[model samples]
Target chain A: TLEYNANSKLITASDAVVALSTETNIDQINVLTTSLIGETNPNFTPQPNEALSKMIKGLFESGMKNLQQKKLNEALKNVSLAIEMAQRKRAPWEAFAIQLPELHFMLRSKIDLCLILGKHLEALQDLDFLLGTGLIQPDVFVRKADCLLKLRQWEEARATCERGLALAPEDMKLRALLIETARNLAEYNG
Target chain B: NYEYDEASETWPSFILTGLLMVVGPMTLLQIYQFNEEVFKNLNEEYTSDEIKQFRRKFNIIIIVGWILVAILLQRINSNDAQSTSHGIALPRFLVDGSASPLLVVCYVALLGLILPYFVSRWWARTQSYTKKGIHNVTASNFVSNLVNYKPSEIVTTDLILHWLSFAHEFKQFFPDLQPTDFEKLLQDHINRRDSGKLNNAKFRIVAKCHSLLHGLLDIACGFRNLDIALGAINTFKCIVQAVPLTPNCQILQLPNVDKEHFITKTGDIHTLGKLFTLEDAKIGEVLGIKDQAKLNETLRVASHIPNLKIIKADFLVPGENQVTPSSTPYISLKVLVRSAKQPLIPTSLIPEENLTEPQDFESQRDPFAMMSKQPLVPYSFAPFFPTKRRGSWCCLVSSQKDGKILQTPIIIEKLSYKNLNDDKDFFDKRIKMDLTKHEKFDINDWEIGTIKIPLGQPAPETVGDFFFRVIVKSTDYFTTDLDITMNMKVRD
Candidate 1:
């Protein structure tokens, strides 16, 4: 049976997941829903949480669009909201919560001004969050190496290249990078 | 209101304070903080369209404000100076003055509204300009059309003429210097074209030519006591002539032995027209008769075939040595002609224009091919050493369209009698020096004596491999540079 939700659409548990994923604050949705239930407990039901589900779906669609567009700020906003909507108490099932901080940092990186401002710690924090969530990939090491090279830390850059090499043995780019490290270190020592 | 008078120094002092406005530095703060994404989106398209306009407007406002402030300050200071000297110490309004305080209040009030409005308007219109066009030329297209053989052949002419002039100069200095050697050099060059190692031969020829030039210069040094000044002008003329013409293709003549052996011979003569029978014709008249029957008969009987097609001709009267200098008087006229085709055959009948005047030559063809407009790739010709026992090693290294020559020294040094078997050590012990300086006198001697394979000496069957350095040096005291290529090759 069809049901109407917050945004005036049919709702489902998957729809709730999609909506909750777009939010920053999971607790806010719980508070809002609790207030609604307190006012009209008889109207609410577990079989068809259409309002919550609609909000979840709307947030997911908007969040994915923003992320795809590389509009990190908009994406973060939507994703945070979706997460909040899903985590609402007695409202719907739990939405994915583990990837929020990772997404936030990824959006912040798009600005590029952060690097100029020497926000190495912020970049590292982002890496840590992504890595903890098992979202880090070979490209992440390349990014770290680029940052380290700019900092003029040759050894760390070489180590980064080595890590990348383990993932892509046939990559001449990585090998060249290692060679450059060796050459630069030789010059520095000399 | 009271006005200050010269005779009266005393001024009224009356003060009534308003109820102390208990304003503890009331701070009014306003920040129009834009969301980062919103601001960025706005800027992205905005910058491409209006940034230049904004910059221009902003610049004008700053400049106008600076000028106005400067003028206003100057006016106020000058007026205040004059007033103070006349004993008008302060404004009357501040001390019980002649004017009402309301005028001053109105002036200040007007400034507050006007200043903010002007600033805001200027800021809003700052970025209103768009770029109209980009200024760039597509060099890639032009570069793609450059032909390698054309420029090279052009330089080859200069290269040859340079040596010929050197030969002339050296012959004048050292009368014993054999003309046969110069003739042999020319023969070797001509032979190289047929030998299939023309490229390698060209490089060697350039080096030899340069060395011969330096030898002449050295001989010039010997003539310090004489009036000879190295005639840079005359030498320059020779350089102009040496650049080879685009090889004329239509002219084919039986190879003459004059170039091979150092002897002149009356070889075969096959003319397109019959031998003259006391017939005198006016300038620009066609040489053969209309039927051309006698001409054909003469050509048929002639032992050698006539191949050169006379495309165009200019009559040169005897004593008129050059193509230019229109004022020269002529007695006997000789026809000046160009080949009808290209890949110009090397023949006695079609002698190349002498390099004595490069500018005049270049003007007749494409001007860029002219040597004067373009600087020659920097190279040095130095004296070859007599001690060097081996044939000349010509190393040709081309970068872009430029060419350079490095002559390898011919002599091998004896380390010790026992070291003859130690070939590796012998090589290791070989002397190396900066080619540019032309210093390394020993190596230079070795090169002159050994490396330069004279004309007529058969080119090696295989390419020679060698090693040399290009060194550049400069200081307040001296400056010099040279590229010494060391490599080997043989005519294929």
Candidate 2:
């Protein structure tokens, strides 16, 4: 049986229960989840079924579990689908504001999975997207360069390394990659 | 009358005696003058004061010896005159005009031949040109030993001459030794010899030998020691023969590779061709392997991927904003990749979950258990985003899409605004959309992986309202695009 909370204007399952077995009104659940996720909602209401949020949470949990189990393909599938659901349900930016931390973890996990699966080109695409965000992480650029190297794209590898270097000029790893790339090119030419 | 005739006959004897006296001293003077010229040339090489004094004293001795010969001739004449007056006088052989030839011959032999020979021998001894004392040896033997000795072993001009002269006598030992071969060996010997001590006189002798050997040798013989021996002998022969010492061009030797080995007459072994050893091939192989190893190592390192730390980005244009109807708009960015310190991750506050546990009805019964079973957030946060946003702005300008306007708006121009903060205030009319139908953005211009937008201005009368959109796309999968919006008012 289903019931609707008139004050919160949200539908709920009759048997639905909040954690800790305390009989709480829907208003308390809305306030608790909102505050827990570090989001601000002036006219907040509890989710009626909690199904969508729970599904997102469940998908994210499964992804992390699969990742730990070294089930990269499964991990990637779950996380990627979770991101899609999050995007479809709410405006991307709105969702980001609410679950920015969760999204960040998801993307990082996806990238790690992509690299491990030898999907270098796909990893590079994701890396480029990540770099475009104006978030110049040296490690990301390094990962991009590594993908290029793995693909045997010497020129592109050098270019990626050079870009990485421009961001973190004192990055020894990037410098080392650049030097090695130069040597590789030379060897290739020879 | 008989006595006057007898005095006239004695006149012939007296005349012969005077002629004999003058010739002895005059010849001796001429010989001394010749010795003086030789000494003058030799002086350049001979620096010892002893030789100088010996020359001077010898000249005096020669003069004194001539004077004594004169006195002896006069005494003989006087004795002959005293005997002639007595009836039991000396034999006619002493006073007779017919016997004047015998006395003159005797005088010439005594002063001219014998004296000059002894004087020359004495001069040679004094100059040390000839071997003396216990070391007394023929010039040939001395030269032979000199050649056998290392160049550093010899010290004097005479020794070098001896060395050079050894080649001449060497021919007797090796009749097959060609003059050319002899010359080549001599030159090699000279070059190998200690040049420091080959100064002045010794140098000249060596120079003369070099010139003389080449001038004389014709054939190119193939023996090493025999060639040296022949060179020495010929050089000595040339010097002795007083051949003019002009520089001699060297004869080229046959290549020493791939040729037979033979013994020289002087017992020295010579190989015709260059010799190659197994050791040389081994060394070459080792070096080749070493180089290959280095190349492989470089390739391996290049193949290995390294962790990167920083990537800086900026817009291509410094200060361009707003679009004009007639101009093409383009956005370009520069990216710099570098390695730096890794971003720190905050510790996770979330509890760990038993991922292996089945999602059975029992676990679902407890809401707290289900919520706590959430995945541990991968280390609290990775600040992988760009650190600075100085030139991070990206814009898209297009006409609003509706059923009435099926055609995409013409994007006439787009400009990257990197440093125009003042113009930013002018953009007040703003709107934003998650998706746009206009897909005409040139991907080629953004190959450098930077954000750029090509914008176009719409005609006021033709379009409802022109839209200007600014957006920032970042790496996270679920993050919304960051964007700003503005409207461009176009009037006819």
Candidate 3:
């Protein structure tokens, strides 16, 4: 009554469609057999024909074949769609803003070097980046403004701090910087 | 990093999981690569949290709508598979109930095509309308709290005069409302409010909305009118300094100086012109300020307060002796501008194309887009309000008869300050600033150039004497209107 074939398939040639192909790939029955027979766990063991699911495999092959021709056809639409889709990529946001590219870039490079330089130029560039990148934030404006006060570019610093307070009304540093910068701008302008 | 600095954190991946669990796979991918046009069309003033909530709700609906729809499709397919087995000679997978081949196809069809098509359908701008409405309610309490009307805070005569003229300029296709009528209307409004007319919600906002809407729309379609344009210009002074429409109060807008010193001074110093004429050292000596930079700062802001002086004003026909009735005449206008003292700004700092040109009245419109590192004008400055007044002046020629327009209005924002010539690198910056004159006029402050307003128009068809008004309306200063009559003659 019981038989095992070389293919490890259903040896009984039943009329049912599930018997058409070998079913070794099915994990559902492997677990069922493991649970019922109480023998060596075949579930832990790996074999050459590792499971990718069998009757489902036949369906997937048809699925792949069926999906192939149309997707290839749809590729024409997708090519245009992608050509429309994978579509594009501000200015030289820097080159447009920084007119003294040579001096500005050089000044920016060693801005923190107190030996021969100060940090204003670099911080100014940082604000420029923040602003150009759409972070004309209160903090960003204040930082640049504070540097302007230290650098004694009072007029620039005054405006810079003023703009920071515009965004963040409560910023104390901006307020202090503004107070100092205003004095310097007045003095400098005077 | 400072605690106040903003950073976008963590939730996107959690939302992605929500997307997978809810709508199906790759929904975020479709929603993302987000079509720039529709998303950008948004008024785009959401808080980051608001946008986060938008995404969260969107993902939630996707799972709720999308995943459920996918499951619904799978159920439809699986149910269809039951009957298909006995009917057709199909592939084993399709006939076998356990394989669920149809469910996989349904998911690919829906996830790839169906669900993506309409899910993100442009959030219909209504949410913003609702948010703004909520904002109105929230902001109402603050203004309400401040409205002791601070009894003496208002200068009635100037305020009424401002309201009258503002109403006149803001009128669209209507006769100017006289100052006499405005007081009555004002009193009526107060009486009505005191009598509790605004109890209904929709009734209140809806009524105010239409009026404010028209006030805005009048400028949009009618900014071409000199009256309205001048009206628009004055509205800035009215709003920014929180002062009446008079220049007498404009001196109060300076940073370090206050009316406390103004009242305490040897002479009355309420007017900007008086402040303008004051000696440079007196700002610190007189305004109770001691710091050099602070005094200097006040002096700098004082001089920059848009108070202008006209060295000369004229209207001349280059060749003709007088305007000929019934014939067109070429008229030349020569006006020169001077500031009492100059403020300095650099020409080296440049802005990119399509840069956010700061609004004349409102400082930040879509500040959200710019919250991270938004660019700002190199020279724009104001303390009381966020928006920077461009030191802009509108120069127009109007007829005294029926207040008709005689010449096209000219807006001068290429403000001139005498100190711009003093930049050590000026000669070099002048060489490097290769942009147009408009660009030159805006950035550099040294240009105290003779403004040539060369005007041409056809002479009136009648030979008579007619008087016309010459006005230079300043945004932050008092208007300069000269009333003079000219003889129109016929050549015999």
Candidate 4:
């Protein structure tokens, strides 16, 4: 059901394109979100008066290398390191404002590895951690339910879609996901 | 004429500001919309998930095969020595006269691995329906870890340059949106929009960004952060008009009128004075907008420009009409300010003073004492900037000849109508009594924002009438200016 079409390789291949599109959307500049940067924070940048991205860039580059080699575990671990540091300081506006989109790349890359390596449960846990972060985009809901769909947890996928619609009614992709989830549930007598 | 505020140091605004300065906002949106050219090349061979799919089939087959072996082992171990059950019910336990402990151990160990990985699949499916809910957990976690921070901490520039230079916030989005680039991006967008090349999405995004900047202006003003306010004000004006701020060219921005036709037909008019001087009917003909209401709106916005008229200006010393060196005197100007679009409510009474007098007004009759207390309410206007920025004027006292400021300027952040009442009979009665003294006594009743300007040694140096200019400045659809010169006179 998730495949939509078998012979349509482009449709199947389109995840990379869509992911790239989402990659851009994930990194869009939202002023309110990035209001505070380069403030006093001990987590992401330790050396006072140092360049803000020094520590984070190292981890992200490491993650990128492993991801290119399709080394899911190594990539996932490297990316997750930055995610932890990106949000280590949970104080009000203390999280590195510059890390908002940076995390979108790393946090996003980590989840990609978990899903790619066929660890639906691990993706479930990681996506849950992000969903509760509050600062999220509509595409997050789409991905979370997509994980649940692979797990065959139909009802939860429907609920996830409902939440996405509640926040943003214009999410057409989420709207389509909900329709498919509904179709599977009725046929399975769920 | 109004001073544009410069303080724009909030988070969301910082991101937008940096992106605007660093790059063409169009390129930034191109990526955001993901309609970038790279999506073009993907038109051919697709990136199907063949690896994850094949991996999934292998795991499924391995788990089912493992589970089947565990079940068959359990059946063989539970045999009741009955030969008819199956050929595989081995007689090893029969020979030993005991159910094979080895078979039992093998069955249990194999089932251990099979139980969690496979059964949890079913468990995961069931839990989706039976589990309580997930929405509440996010809220709980957020509340539990909630940290408190004020706006002051966020806006302070004393921190590192990362916090000081707001462009770092947008750099996360466009990695190369270097600190200098945010300002460049903003400059580029302003140029593009003014040139009529910016798209709607880009326009709205910048508009929203500036809208919040305006909101934060009030916060800056409240905190007495003049630098931040000035930055935001300048950006707001640039984003709105994009054209050089002038009464005539900005009038082209009014609704409904065809700008090209209006400019051509108005005799190449460009000044506010002659534009309004044309007959209203003639103005309408050139505008050629059929809907009269829309034309009215065009005029309405233009009319929102500040109009100032000075009714009277004088230096008062309580008992004397004219300025005196011995007594403390203040400039009391009864000026009329109005809006052309609609009637406005003027702020009456001296600022930071109670609407009604204290009950013990007689004992505390020291008027100057009250003036010396706290300098009037800090020039905070957050409550007033968002809707209509009306009645705000900056009065600059300067030497007309020298082109230099004479004294500290007065900021009438708002205007008031509360003190304009006049008694004709009192005027008649006081004219003959003490001439200047009566006018001096009557100064108590005037409604005005400026009460004093320090003269010190400069007060005694002046021997005769000397001219100085008072420039009242404001901001809105256009920069508003009211410059007039007045003569200062000594007491008789």
Candidate 5:
């Protein structure tokens, strides 16, 4: 019963996306994305496909614009709203994909904030969680490695750099980090 | 009917009475909750059983003894000669009345014996039920014990450095012990290693060895023996636990770097060399100043640095001929000072004045004053220690030491007119009094619980309304600070 309701809402949201695009209202696109990224409302019932199509159109346009401009904040805003709209339209799969961009953006923002604030202790908390969950991709691994370096957490930094290098062999930045990591390890030995 | 048998008649009844006397008081005691104050205050010394047995025996003895006396008196009254014997010199009333006084004494003694036992039993029962109805939530035991100890100031920022330093210090005194013991001890609780099976003698030896090493460090750090050991252990535990419990940026939807920590010799060497050089320079400067005037001048100049503020200063042996503040003036120059830049102190003590504040500073606001004035019913914030509420209010267990919060609002509610009073005039007048006149707000059953704060997570600066709400429906005003502070030192 839960699954059906969730999927039906996604479809209805997809319809709304289409309608919003037809109306040429871009401002509402981001709001729709934001809603998508938020926690789902269990009380909501899915609307029909025609409504879903309009909502989908609005979400897609907003997502594409945000992504092309590399505006993570805007991308997060649009994508989350897009997901929520799709979910409301009963399009479950589409709803799921939309939340990822927002999650990524939020992570980046917080990490950067911690670094700027000189909250090494606080930043490590996030890094530790990422590693423990095994969700760290190459990009995340690189950032974590740098934080470790700053904290003089040499061994952990080296390990993270190694992981990043293995994942993105062709990436020059990873290669450089690996070199610096090795140097630090040697110095530690002495 | 058979001929009267005096021995049989009395013996059977006596046996029956004996059984009753043996079992009656014990049975009653088992049934009664005897420890209530009414019974205890009776000042009885003997137990119920003792009193019952004494009464039964005394009654039987009195009955037998008096019967013999009666026989003797009657004999005396039976004078065979011309003169009828004066039957009994004393009157019958005097003899009967003697038993009456004895009976009265026994009854009073019985009451004294039984009351206190019941009083105490009742009190115990009441206490048992009351304790059972409530759960006592507290900070995590591990964190609490650790916080009781003093951690090393130098190793606060870099947890690994702290761990290694701790390990080194542990190893110093126990030269005969294996290095692995340090690791084992470090991982004892978290790793669930069993050291209980170790031979008691060996354990004692190891304990002594470890104590000596810690003792030296304490002396070096200018800390008391137990204080330094406790601090180091607590600091170590806090750091280790933090690694696993704190959410990563990815989970919190926050930005985070991807780097992992690794031990590096270069980093260690760099930090160690810097510390050694600073210490060496300081020592050299102090020793080089042979002239007292020169020394005082240099000391005055050095003290000018904001970081140079004396964090701790105490004589090792005050009056034992070493150095008195007056004698050598600076002979026993043992002191430990921490800089504002040091991470050991919480951010609130950063000495930056305005910039330094506790992480959750906004939650310290007084919610009582925020309510409307001239309330029909007086109300006040419920008096509960905030440290105790942290687990329920914050969704996180915190071990706070010497920390206080005033702005924190666990719960707040917007009271409706119907919720307040049925009459419009009463509601309007109360709201006006509460807001404008600052009249006493009436509160009945004022509830307090965890209110979901917005931005309670990483970099949480602002407060948001949480789900917790403390409802004040009555009118009785009480004034006092709702703020609470926790002063703790982790022990284990």
Candidate 6:
């Protein structure tokens, strides 16, 4: 989970973590994960032992390293395993305490992989779940609108564009989508 | 009525009455002789012109005398009628004709001795030009010239120079004088001598004299002669302090600059300072004198400057060969841009959402590129937009030829963006886009490159005209969604 580099005189993720190159990437991954796993979750009680906590941390670091390297499949496997270990009934209390962070990183990496692979339906499902967690972003709505448009769901695409427009009234991309959606609807009706 | 008989009249009484009658005429003759002597003596002191004026006034006195004698004779006749009507008997002294002789003798003495004495004194003081050798004639000559001066006379520089020399010589009289004495003397001359009633030419002369005095002050100051300069300054202060009974004279001060800088580059007087003309009371306001005729008389004498007529003609008369330009090259056009948003947004467009969100996309995509993709949404051909969505597109179109002409597509040649928030340096950072020719053309015929609206930090949400020029190659062109509306919401 943690290692010290002799050349840079810095503590960083170990070789077990695949591709965590810079400290900035590590910080960002950490922050996103923490936000998903709320601090006050009842399952987040510390155990008397440190072994389970250390193992979970190691799996999460390895998942971040895999995500940075574009090895989304391997990233998903490592993060999902970490989440499962945290939620397992026989695991120590510290394991469940960090379970939400592992889930957040895992799902986000899977959505990216889905988008890259043209799995719009799976990416849309992940986005809907992400939105349910109150992690709304403009790209989420834009991506959802794109998926609906790809599926020829003009009405839903227009509705999603409207929602995006409400958030960014001057967003030209959303406005353009609206015009396109209107054109598509007209054509379909004719 | 008791009548005197010639047989009853004694020789002594008859002779005394005759003697009294002769005495009356003799006394009248003697009074005339006395006036003649005084006139002759006064005439010696005056110039030929002054003597002629004195005789003119003296003749008026003689006319008044004749009028008085006529009135006396008429009174005597009235007394005789009154006595007869009352049936009153006349006394011997009255009937003997003694009263007439007594009255004539008394009247003659009164007119001759008292009247001529006072008149002679007044004429000498006000009209005489006689100056004793070695005597200070400053006050006398100043007052006399003021009295007889007319507006028609030309006031030459030479005359002013003469007066200036007189003032310098006159200064010697007040050996122990304070600088303030000069001011006092000037005030006294203006007040008592009625100097305000001078005509323009006369006033100009006075103004020149004042200018000379000021020049003297400048000279004194230049040579470190504080004494003379202080005196001149004090005199100026006195004139300013004195209450003006008429429009006081205006003096133009001589410039005290070095010779090289004395005149302006335009060859005109380089006036360093101007002492304003004094304000005067209304015509009817001088003390107890409320005569409008007198006021008019004074105004007629003092109002105009003789040299101004020539000076005005020299400068104000239009020349014969002057030509005016027939045309100008500058062209102007009224540009009315109606922005889509209310309080038309200045500079950058309002972002729909925070750029911070989806930080990955935010960092990669150019905001201006996104702006360029925004559509120029058109409104229906209605008179007005829907009330509920007034800020929305309101397409202006017409069914007629003119309307079709407006509806023709026009290409935007250049787009310039200015940030209203950065008002001080808004022009300094004007972002210009040139769209002469481009591959991608928008629906409105505007080149895509020209449509890239620049984004600014903390985007301005104020009213401003989004300036851009559109070129129409054909005869018709239309600007659709250029409405100026308010930004209902501004997203951070």
Top candidate, metric TM-score = 3
| lDDT values, one for every candidate | 0.33, 0.40, 0.40, 0.47, 0.35, 0.38
Model 1 chain B scores worst on lDDT over the 10 consecutive residues at: B472-481
Q: Can you tell me which runs of candidate 4 are displaced by over 4 Å?
A: A1-190, B1-242, B303-305, B326-328, B338-391, B406-408, B416-462
Please name the candidate that would achieve the greatest lDDT relative to the true structure. 4
Deviation (Å) of B164 in candidate 4:
14
Sorted into a CAPRI-style docking class, model 3 comes out as incorrect
Query: Candidate 1 vs candidate 2: which has greater lDDT?
Result: 2
Q: Please give the DockQ score of every candidate, comma-separated.
A: 0.00, 0.01, 0.01, 0.01, 0.01, 0.00
Give the lDDT of residue B442 in candidate 2. 22
* lDDT accuracy of residue B104 in candidate 3: 89
The ten-residue window of minimal lDDT in model 5 chain A covers: A1-10
Model 3, B1-492: lDDT tens per residue? 112111212222334445556454456666775101111211122113432343344345655666555655555445423433222223334334566877788879989877666554434433323232322322342234223323323223344233433332223322444535444433433222221332232122212322332233233223233434344455544543434443345555555555566656745544444454455576567677778966755554454333333333334333344556655443233233333343223323333222223443233333222222322112334332222233455566655333445555554444334432223222222233543343335543332233334344666676654444455555444422322222334441
| Predicted model 3 interface RMSD | 16.7
Ranking by lDDT: 4, 3, 2, 6, 5, 1
Candidate 6 lDDT over residue span B1-492, tens digit each: 445443333433344445556555666787888001111232132223422443344344445545555555555445523345332233455446658688677889889998999999988766533232222354444444444544334443233334344553334434554434444434443343333332222223233344354444333333432223323433433332222221121111110112233222223211111110112243234222356655443332222111000000000001211112221111011121221111212222223232112334552354334333434322111111011010121111111101011221212322221111122121111122222122331223211112321111122344321111111111011111121111212222
Error of 3 at A82 (Å): 90
lDDT, candidate 1, equals 0.33
TM-score of 6: 0.21
The local lDDT score (0 to 100) that residue A149 gets in candidate 6 is: 86
For model 3, chain A alone compared with the true chain A gives a TM-score of 0.37
Reference-based lDDT, residue A26, model 5 = 39
Candidate 6 chain B — worst ten consecutive residues by lDDT sum?
Answer: B308-317
A39-102 per-residue lDDT for model 4 (tens digits): 5343543222224356777877888898778688888787777777655532234345444556
In the range A35-148, model 3's lDDT, one tens digit per residue, is 334334444332212121233234334433433564433333232222221111001112333323422332222232221224356556645653544334565666577566
